[PDB]
């Protein structure tokens, strides 16, 4: 019943079932031919009584070897190609799901663990499909057929000792596990010793200042003693593990082969059956390891597939709400907004506010308050539950969130870079308009073309995957240029202004304020450099908005103590 | 020639060569017995025509098996025990050298890599001593003896094809290396794809805000398409490999064993000696891996022993200079002090200053100047080259450096913890005076016992190996108490101030100042309280001392001169 999710997930890829089944059957046929090769060898050994049939049998054996090799090659190619196709389909589905998934999932669950899980589990499912299931089938067939053929050919005597010998496994396995436990304990002790040394060494200045180095040496000696004692123990235990194992193996070996040799001398039904027996043992041994590896890999892959389905079970909506955007130019209202991330916690409580259209607005939050939550709420990445973020009559729930997003410009603190060139990084918002060649001209409108006039190149200017040769000063100018290029209708900022100092700050701020003067603006940062240019100021504390009006003149009557205390912490 | 350093290093630990040589000889004897065993098996197989001799030979074989097991067990125990003793000696020598190595070496070269080259190279040398040398000797003996015995047993026919077949290594090994190369290329591609995804995902806020889900999905699809192409190429290359490896190995096995059985059946002498031949094949194939592993580990160990000797090559001293300390109370003067880390750079140039005795002196330095160099120079951690830090009418080495350090208390920025209990913290000053039982009293006047008045425990007060349950203020207070306990004669601080806050800062400053009440004090911090807490002031700039006199005059003049820039940095 646990394989049903795996079958459904593989079905999601629309596999070529016929080709996979044909490849598996061809692998079975190859295993059956490898089950036949030793019989031909036995026939050759028995037929050495004359020389021409020896040559004919050698030719037949070579032909069977080549046929087996070719059949196995084609089966492996079909298996691997189908596995790669299934993995490509699975990765396509997973990446389509991840990108469309709401930003809440990324913030509240993980960022790199998701990509890790995706890649690792796709690789595990590939290993289960292309190798381990066929490997298990081939191993089962090989073991069963070899045991049956040994029973038919060399009969009870030798095969019974062959399957009584695995009592040697009941002596090897506990011994091997004791070796593993002692090795793990020694490794842990070594880790403790190196941790002690790595703790002591950085404070060597303090050690020598106190002139207690000898004492530390003594401490070190104790560690070197401890390991030694444990090491000695390992030695003793290894002296009961190293030889004994070999002994048992050799004993088993001799026994088996010895009986074969004996049955050759006594005249029993064994002339070339001994050679066939050794070849069948060699075909027996490896499939045991293959089966064990398959069992462990299935134990891992069931959980991997469960994680796959857990990723593929989420949902998100982009245009489902509706499509009725026409102007997107109206005062925005927060009405009874009270919701955070989980309804139980209630990180937001009864937040209400008004913002006019075409006026710069500020959102000042404390260090650890609800400024980030309020930003994400206004930025429409969080689904409203109780309150209403309205544009009048609350149309935001009846038209596409993508229509909202196309009309919003956003750069908050860094927005570092999107892997590519400058033209693509300012062309990230091609809403099917292609934007012609306005881009660089708009950069001149954003005072960016004259800033990039040095021009290492235009289209080949590579920021690299790392993105480190450009400081934060140049990238934020590019971000502002892109924001004004896409759709200057409503713009929101965490005031990407930084340590750039007035020289760059003056230019970037004057450009921004002159361009988006006629359109709605929101600022959410802490600095007061933007609040003087913000027509309306709002303050947030304890998940509640307190303060409406012009500016610092009005917080002088409302936040003259609490807001002043946070600003005092800021002056530090 | 290259083994001489290894032999010398082993000799440094008194190897007790007799036991090691006896263990090696016993291993050789065990290998000879293992070579003997298949001949006894062949005797039993040939003699299996009547039952009693079969039982006698089985008993003899079992006795030889047990003798071999016991001899191998004792040889392994002796080898491992001698190796552990050698490693303990080497670790003791290395740790003594490390703890006695100069501080200047530690900061300029490495911190954790030094511990790595005491923990990992010792393990490598152990692997070479206990296992790989004996393993190589026993493998060479086994291979040569088995080839010789097979030559005297089957002569031209079987053993020539025996040797000729593993020339199929010239067919297998290139194929395996091509497999490894293709696997490495695929792994690199998947690593690049994982990096691309881990770069895309954290920018999901910008990705959705700009509404480029389709673009990012397309880029991910291109990445997984490249991965699919790599997988298809790997699939083809593996399909032209796996069946080839199986075919070559099975053709080898069939040729050898079928020829053996063919000789057995024909009448050509082989009787039941095919059993001995198979056992000799099993004793031949195993030690090849041991020989190859020995060669690779010999390369690694001959690389690591040089690092061992280089660590052990360096030297340092603490009392060779002399022993001429009687008072250690005299004004401190700098006389044309010019030395840094390397004579070529000359980071210090003719630094000179006058410091009285019992007068607190403050040092002011810039962010990246030479304040740290002079700070470490005053502690005598760096060897004078040209200039002289004269204390004692010029001779500063007439007395032992340990004696100079003994009269010194030191805590600069953190001085985090010496892991264990507060007993170690207060007893690090146990310079043969044991302090009787006055440590708690010493804590009492030093204003530490009332700080620990909550008393979780007195002697069992534990801080943990990590040392995170106490704050910076408390550990700095304990450091001050230790400094006042050892020898409150001459003191230098960097005024460790991290999280004490005004109350604790003033408390520790007043207690510390009361405690010396007439002993020399040195301060090198940047805080203005620390610099007003000093009768005489200094200033460091460009590796030169510029400024002498009283606090107010210097602070007013230096700020007038150029120190106002550093001050402006301070208010920031
Ligand atoms: C399914 C049942 O059938 C079986 C078929 C084969 C084996 C079997 N597979 C083996 C693989 C390796 C060894 C083996 N590896 C060895 C390594 C070293 C030595 N030495 C060399 C030197 N030392 C000191 C003494 C012996 C013997 C060794 N014998 C024995 C083995 N016996 C067991 C059961
Ligand atoms: C000359 C010195 O003497 C030698 C004697 C033996 C070997 C030798 N050592 C071997 C170890 C493993 C294998 C082997 N590994 C296999 C893996 C798979 C299969 N299969 C299982 C299913 N497939 C499809 C068919 C056969 C057979 C296999 N046979 C062959 C081997 N031949 C080498 C030199």
Report phi then psi at B245, rounded to 5: -65, -45
| Sheet of strand B388-390, all strands in order from the earlier edge strand to the far edge | B351-355, B332-337, B388-390
Q: Is A281 in the pocket of ligand 1 (CB under 6 A)?
A: yes
* Residue B110: closest CA among B314, B294, B271, B248: B314
What is the token pair recorded at A2? 């646990």
Task: Tell whether A456 lies on the interface with B, counting CB pairs under 8 A.
Answer: no
- Please report the DSSP string for B140-159 in residue order: HHHHHHHHHHHHHHTHHHHH
d(CA A261, CA A434): 83
d(CA B294, CA B140): 11
Q: Is A130 exposed, middle or buried (0-12, 13-18, 19+ CB in 10 A)?
A: buried
**C-alpha gyration radius of chain B:** 37
CB contact under 8 A, A115 and B260: no
Q: Are B66 and B308 in contact (CB under 8 A)?
A: no
What is the token pair recorded at B6? 């290894």
Across the interface, which of A45, A95, A410 has its CB nearest the CB of B261? A45
Q: Name all residues whose Cβ lies below 6 A of ligand 2.
A: A 30-31, 34, 72, 138, 142, 282-283, 286; B 162, 165-166, 246, 249-250, 252-253, 256, 281
Residue identified by tokens 């062309």 is A427
Q: Is A253 in the pocket of ligand 1 (CB under 6 A)?
A: yes
Nearest 5°: CA angle at B417, between B416 and B423?
Answer: 150
Which H/E stretch holds residue B544? strand B544-545
Q: Are A331 and A357 in contact (CB under 8 A)?
A: yes
CB contact under 8 A, B103 and A204: yes
In angstroms, the Cα distances linking A420 to A34, A464, A467, B137, B200 are 54, 7, 10, 59, 12
Could you tell me how far CA B463 lies from the centroid of its own chain?
25
How far away, in angstroms, is A248 Cα from ligand 1 center? 8
- Tell me the domains of chain B and their CATH numbers: 1-319 (no CATH), 320-572 (3.40.50.300)
How far away, in angstroms, is A135 Cα from ligand 1 center? 25
Q: Which chain A residues touch B43 with a CB distance below 8 Å?
A: none
Contacts of B406 (CB under 8 A, 6+ apart): A211, B431, B486, B487
Give the number of the ligand closest to the Cα of residue B283: 1
Across the interface, which of A196, A275, A428 has its CB nearest the CB of B258? A275
How far away, in angstroms, is A490 Cα from ligand 1 center? 78
The alpha carbon dihedral of A365, A371, A374, A375 has a sign of: positive
Could you tell me how far CA B398 lies from the centroid of its own chain?
36
- Please report the DSSP string for B443-505 in residue order: HHHTT-TTTTTT-S-SSS-B-TTT--SS-HHHHHHHHHHHHHHH-TTEEEE----SS-HHHHH
* Residue A79: closest CA among A115, A125, A131, A3: A131
Name residue B2's beta-bridge partners. none
Compare all CA atoms of chain B with the CA of A283 and give the residue at the minimum distance: B250
Q: Which chain B residues touch A197 with a CB distance below 8 Å?
A: 95, 115, 118-119
Please report the beta strands in A467-569, taking only residues with DSSP state E, as ranges in sequence order: 490-493, 520-523, 536-541, 544-545
Entry field: residues in chain A: 572
* CA end-to-end distance (rounded Å), chain B: 64
Q: Are A324 and A399 in contact (CB under 8 A)?
A: yes
What is the token pair recorded at B241? 């490999």
DSSP class of residue B203 equals G
Task: Tell whether A161 lies on the interface with B, counting CB pairs under 8 A.
Answer: no
Ordered alpha helix ranges (H), A266-327: 273-311
Contacts of A260 (CB under 8 A, 6+ apart): A158, A270, A274, A277, A278, B275
d(CA A570, CA A469): 31
Contacts of B165 (CB under 8 A, 6+ apart): B252, B255, B256
Across the interface, which of A85, A106, A244 has its CB nearest the CB of B201? A106
Q: Are B125 and B118 in contact (CB under 8 A)?
A: no
Q: Is A328 helix (H, G, I), strand (E, B) or coil?
A: coil
Q: Is B408 helix (H, G, I), strand (E, B) or coil?
A: strand
Phi-psi label, residue A211: left if phi above 0, alpha if psi -120 to 50, beta otherwise: left
Q: Are B162 and B278 in contact (CB under 8 A)?
A: no
* Residue A512: closest CA among A497, A525, A526: A497
Ordered alpha helix ranges (H), A201-272: 204-209, 213-238, 242-265
* Residue A41: closest CA among B172, B250, B280: B250
**Around B396, how many Cα atoms within 13 Å sit in the side-chain half-sphere?**
23
Closest atom of ligand 2 relative to the A282 alpha carbon: 29
Compare all CA atoms of chain A with the CA of B281 and give the residue at the minimum distance: A253
Which H/E stretch holds residue A411? strand A408-411
Neighbours of B554 (CB within 10 A): 22
d(CA B156, CA B162): 10
Contacts of A416 (CB under 8 A, 6+ apart): A467, A472, A475, B203
Task: Tell whether A228 lies on the interface with B, counting CB pairs under 8 A.
Answer: yes
d(CA A21, CA A409): 53
Neighbours of B436 (CB within 10 A): 7
Q: Is B527 helix (H, G, I), strand (E, B) or coil?
A: coil
Q: What is the dihedral of CA B188, B189, B191, B195, to 10 degrees?
A: 140
d(CA B145, CA A234): 31
Way it was determined: cryo-EM
Neighbours of B496 (CB within 10 A): 20
Nearest 5°: CA angle at B152, between B149 and B155?
Answer: 115
Q: Is B545 helix (H, G, I), strand (E, B) or coil?
A: strand
Determine which of A33, A74, A91, A266 to mutate to test the interface with B (most B C-beta atoms within 10 Å).
Answer: A91
Q: Is B72 exposed, middle or buried (0-12, 13-18, 19+ CB in 10 A)?
A: buried
| Sheet of strand B536-541, all strands in order from the earlier edge strand to the far edge | B408-411, B490-493, B520-523, B360-364, B536-541, B544-545
Contacts of A350 (CB under 8 A, 6+ apart): A336, A337, A338, A544
**Around B127, how many Cα atoms within 13 Å sit in the side-chain half-sphere?**
19
* Residue B210: closest CA among A532, A430, A491: A430
d(CA B458, CA B439): 11
What is the token pair recorded at A188? 């842990």
Which H/E stretch holds residue A7? helix A4-12
Task: Tell whether B468 lies on the interface with A, counting CB pairs under 8 A.
Answer: no
Task: Tell whether A205 lies on the interface with B, counting CB pairs under 8 A.
Answer: yes
Residue identified by tokens 């083994």 is B3
d(CA B348, CA B373): 8
What is the token pair recorded at B107? 């900061």
Could you tell me how far CA A399 lies from the centroid of its own chain?
34
Task: Tell whether A275 lies on the interface with B, counting CB pairs under 8 A.
Answer: yes
* Residue A99: closest CA among B412, B453, B206, B366: B206
Kindly give the pairing relationship between strand B332-337 and strand B388-390.
Answer: antiparallel
Alpha-carbon gap: B328 to the closest alpha carbon of chain A (Å)? 16
Which H/E stretch holds residue B85? helix B51-100
d(CA A106, CA B123): 44
d(CA A78, CA A88): 15
CB contact under 8 A, B73 and A199: no
d(CA A276, CA A39): 6
Contacts of B169 (CB under 8 A, 6+ apart): none
Task: Tell whether A45 lies on the interface with B, counting CB pairs under 8 A.
Answer: yes
What is the token pair recorded at A54? 């020896």
Q: Which chain B residues touch A118 with a CB distance below 8 Å?
A: 197
Residue identified by tokens 């530090």 is A572
Give the number of the ligand closest to the Cα of residue A35: 2
Phi-psi label, residue A322: left if phi above 0, alpha if psi -120 to 50, beta otherwise: left
- Please report the DSSP string for B35-76 in residue order: HHHHHHHHHHHHHTTSHHHHHHHHHHHHHHHHHHHHHHHHHH
How far away, in angstroms, is B247 Cα from ligand 2 center? 8
Q: Which chain B residues touch A272 with a CB distance below 8 Å?
A: 261, 265
CB contact under 8 A, A48 and B81: no
Q: Is A49 helix (H, G, I), strand (E, B) or coil?
A: coil
Please report the beta strands in B292-418, taking only residues with DSSP state E, as ranges in sequence order: 332-337, 351-355, 360-364, 388-390, 408-411
Q: What is the dihedral of CA B295, B299, B302, B307, to 10 degrees?
A: -150
d(CA A117, CA B487): 59
Kindly give the pairing relationship between strand A520-523 and strand A536-541.
Answer: unpaired
Task: Tell whether A104 lies on the interface with B, counting CB pairs under 8 A.
Answer: no
What is the token pair recorded at B227? 């991965």
DSSP class of residue B202 equals G
Neighbours of A53 (CB within 10 A): 14
Task: Tell whether B76 lies on the interface with A, counting CB pairs under 8 A.
Answer: yes
Report phi then psi at A546, rounded to 5: -135, 105
d(CA A477, CA A473): 7
Q: Is A357 helix (H, G, I), strand (E, B) or coil?
A: coil
Q: Is A163 in the pocket of ligand 1 (CB under 6 A)?
A: no
d(CA B398, CA B128): 47
Closest atom of ligand 1 relative to the A249 alpha carbon: 32
In angstroms, the Cα distances linking A542 to A176, A380, A546 are 61, 21, 10
d(CA B56, CA A36): 39
d(CA B365, CA B531): 12
Q: Are A311 and A109 in contact (CB under 8 A)?
A: no
Task: Tell whether A429 lies on the interface with B, counting CB pairs under 8 A.
Answer: yes
The alpha carbon dihedral of B261, B262, B264, B268 has a sign of: negative
- What is the count of residue pairs from A and B with beta carbons less than 8 Å apart? 319
What is the token pair recorded at B146? 């088995």
* Residue B491: closest CA among B452, B535, B524, B448: B524
Give rounded-to-5 percent helix, strand, coil for chain B: 65, 5, 30
Q: Are B360 and B534 in contact (CB under 8 A)?
A: yes
CB contact under 8 A, B381 and A205: yes
């Amino acid at each position: 019943s646990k394989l049903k999710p795996f079958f459904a997930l593989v079905r999601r890829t629309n596999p070529s079932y016929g080709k996979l089944a044909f490849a598996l059957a061809l692998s079975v046929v190859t295993t059956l031919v490898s089950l036949l090769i030793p019989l031909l060898t036995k026939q050759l050994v028995d037929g050495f009584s004359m020389s021409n049939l020896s040559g004919t049998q050698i030719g037949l054996i070579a032909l069977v070897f080549f046929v087996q090799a070719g059949l196995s090659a084609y089966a492996t190619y079909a298996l691997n190609y189908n596995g790669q196709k299934i993995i490509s389909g699975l990765r396509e589905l997973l990446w389509k799901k991840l990108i469309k998934l709401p930003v809440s999932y990324f913030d509240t669950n993980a960022s790199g663990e998701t990509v890790s899980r995706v890649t690792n589990d796709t690789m595990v499912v590939k290993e289960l499909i292309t190798t381990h299931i066929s490997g298990f089938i081939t191993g089962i067939i090989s073991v069963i057929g070899s045991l049956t053929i040994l029973f038919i050919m060399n009969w009870k005597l030798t095969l019974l000792v062959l399957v009584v010998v695995p009592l040697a496994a009941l002596i090897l396995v506990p011994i091997g596990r004791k070796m593993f436990s002692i090795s793990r304990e020694t490794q842990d002790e070594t880790a403790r010793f190196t941790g002690l040394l790595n703790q002591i060494l950085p404070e060597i200045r303090l050690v020598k200042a106190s002139n207690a180095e000898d004492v530390e040496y003594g401490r070190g000696k104790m560690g070197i003693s401890s390991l030694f004692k444990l090491g000695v123990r390992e030695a003793k235990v290894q002296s009961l593990v190293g030889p004994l194992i070999s002994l048992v193996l050799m004993a088993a070996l001799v026994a088996v082969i010895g009986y074969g040799g004996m049955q050759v001398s006594s005249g029993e039904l064994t002339a070339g059956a001994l050679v066939a027996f050794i070849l069948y043992l060699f075909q027996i041994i490896m499939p045991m390891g293959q089966i064990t590896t398959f069992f462990t890999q299935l134990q891992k892959s069931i959980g991997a597939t469960e994680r796959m389905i857990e990723i593929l079970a989420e949902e998100e909506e982009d245009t489902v709400t509706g499509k009725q955007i026409e102007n997107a130019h109206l005062p925005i209202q927060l009405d009874r907004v009270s919701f955070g991330y989980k309804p139980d916690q209630l990180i937001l409580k009864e937040v209400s506010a008004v913002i006019e259209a075409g006026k710069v607005t500020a959102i000042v939050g404390p260090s650890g308050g609800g400024k980030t939550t309020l930003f994400k709420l206004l930025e429409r990445f969080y689904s409203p539950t109780a309150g209403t973020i309205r544009l009048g009559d609350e149309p935001v729930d009846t038209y596409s969130l993508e229509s909202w997003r196309e009309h919003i410009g956003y750069v908050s603190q860094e927005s570092p870079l999107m892997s590519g060139t400058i033209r693509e990084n300012i062309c990230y918002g091609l809403e099917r308009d292609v934007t012609d060649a306005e881009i660089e001209k708009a950069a001149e409108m954003a005072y960016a073309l004259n800033f990039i006039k040095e021009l290492p190149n235009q289209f080949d200017t590579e920021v690299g995957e790392r993105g480190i040769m450009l400081s934060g000063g140049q990238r934020q100018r590019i971000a502002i240029a892109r924001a004004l290029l896409r759709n200057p209708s409503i713009l929101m900022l965490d005031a990407a202004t930084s340590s750039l100092d007035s020289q760059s700050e003056k230019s970037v701020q004057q450009a921004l304020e002159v361009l988006m003067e006629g359109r709605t603006t929101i600022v959410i940062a802490h600095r007061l450099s933007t609040v003087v240019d913000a027509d309306q100021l709002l303050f947030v504390e304890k998940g509640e908005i307190t303060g409406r009006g012009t500016h610092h003149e009005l917080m002088a009557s409302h936040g003259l103590y609490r807001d002043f205390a946070e600003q005092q912490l800021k002056m530090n």
